[PDB]
UniProtKB/TrEMBL annotation:
Stretch of the intact protein here: 25 to 426 of 775
All residue ranges annotated as the Kinesin motor domain in the record: 3-375
Entry binding sites for ATP: 76-83
Organism lineage string: Eukaryota, Metazoa, Ecdysozoa, Nematoda, Chromadorea
Organism the protein comes from: Caenorhabditis elegans
Protein name: Kinesin-like protein
Intracellular or extracellular location(s): Cytoplasm, Cytoskeleton
Length: 375
């Protein structure tokens, strides 16, 4: 089955004294400047972005097309390649998981409709306008609302051509046990704290977070960059590092049965027929991390560790006699309650720096390993 997988990626290191070395392409050995860790896959400095992306994201996108949910974390110290893995630089050798994922999603879906047909509604739902109403909304929206960049050409199969679809993104930040919508229409010049809660389907969501409709990989990246502008607003109004907070970018594939007897591509009007699947990409705060800020980060990452360990034991246990996931011990873990209770697919990418300076911090990062062996 599709249990949680943890993979590890070494960043480039031009030194003679490494704190860890890759062995089996699925194993890593500790090196004092005494433990061996086993992962589902180990990437070396030679493994480029394209290799990571296919091994890390293609099966999650295939999940998305199947109407199932997926969750991907990047974990590690600052300067570990965590942001490089996730986003990188918009070049052929530099682009990370997120833009390639957006590219492949938009390459692989069919029957993508125009905007304002689907639209977000109360309590984490979507409704459906009639076409002429949506048409004016588009021209109402267009009153509101230069990338030379590498683009992934990969097209995956598996989209349900009996479904019509639209793509919505939410971009959310968890900083100091408070949750913020980086896509909020901020009026006061301050981001509003947001509540993490469930809907009637028991699915977690951010109450007042904005679901932004995007028609292309390009448009989705424009929205992502807008969120990055908000993400850089520190408490002291300086530049806040991505290591200081958790960033949650959720790609939603909103689907509905295609309507017959029309020359257009349009859903059936019954909104209860809507199916929504998620691919959620999370760029965790740096594991090395303003005192309450660092305590929230270590509390949340420690809760995450405990939760995936409970998740692993539950995946081997029976229907009864399975143990509670302590997901309420942090805001971050609460937001992914469904995944940590075994719904959907979770993949964690442990980014580690082989430099001997990051030795002790790699010991905590490699503790996420599926299993461990001692010298």
């Amino acid at each position: 089955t599709d249990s949680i997988e943890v993979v590890c990626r070494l960043c480039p290191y031009t030194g003679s004294t490494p704190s860890l070395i890759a062995i089996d392409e699925g194993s890593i050995q500790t090196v004092l400047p005494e433990k061996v860790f086993r992962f589902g896959r180990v990437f070396s400095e030679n493994d480029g972005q394209a290799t990571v992306f296919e091994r890390t994201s293609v099966d999650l996108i295939l999940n998305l097309l199947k109407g199932q949910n997926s969750l991907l974390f990047t974990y590690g110290v600052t300067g570990s390649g965590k942001t490089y893995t996730m986003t990188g630089k918009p070049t052929e050798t530099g682009t990370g998981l997120l833009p390639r994922t957006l590219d492949v999603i938009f390459n692989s879906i069919n029957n993508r409709v125009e905007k304002c047909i689907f639209y977000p509604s109360a309590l984490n739902t979507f409704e459906i306008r009639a076409t002429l109403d949506a048409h004016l909304k588009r021209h109402q929206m267009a009153a509101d609302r230069i990338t030379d960049r590498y683009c992934e050409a990969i097209k995956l199969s598996g989209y349900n051509d009996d479904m019509v679809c639209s793509v919505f993104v939410t971009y959310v930040e968890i900083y100091n046990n408070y949750c913020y919508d980086l896509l909020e229409d901020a009026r006061n010049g301050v981001l509003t704290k947001r509540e993490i809660r469930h809907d009637r389907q028991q699915q977690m969501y951010v109450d007042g977070a904005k679901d932004v409709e995007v028609s292309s990989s390009e448009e989705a990246l424009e929205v992502f960059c807008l969120g990055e502008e908000r993400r850089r607003v520190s408490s002291t109004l300086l530049n806040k590092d991505s290591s200081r907070s958790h960033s949650v970018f959720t790609i939603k594939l909103v689907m509905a049965p295609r309507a017959y007897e029309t020359k257009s591509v349009y859903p059936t009007m019954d909104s209860s027929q809507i199916i929504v699947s998620q691919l959620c990409l999370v760029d965790l705060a740096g594991s090395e991390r303003r005192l309450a800020e660092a305590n929230s980060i270590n509390q949340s990452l420690m809760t995450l560790r405990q939760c995936i360990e409970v998740l692993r034991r539950n995946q081997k246990s029976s229907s009864q006699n399975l143990e509670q996931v302590p997901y309420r011990q942090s805001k971050l873990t609460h937001l992914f309650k469904n995944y940590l209770e075994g719904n959907g697919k979770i993949r964690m990418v442990i980014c580690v720096n082989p430099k001997p300076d990051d030795y002790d911090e790699n010991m905590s990062a490699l503790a996420f390993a599926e299993e461990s062996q001692t010298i």
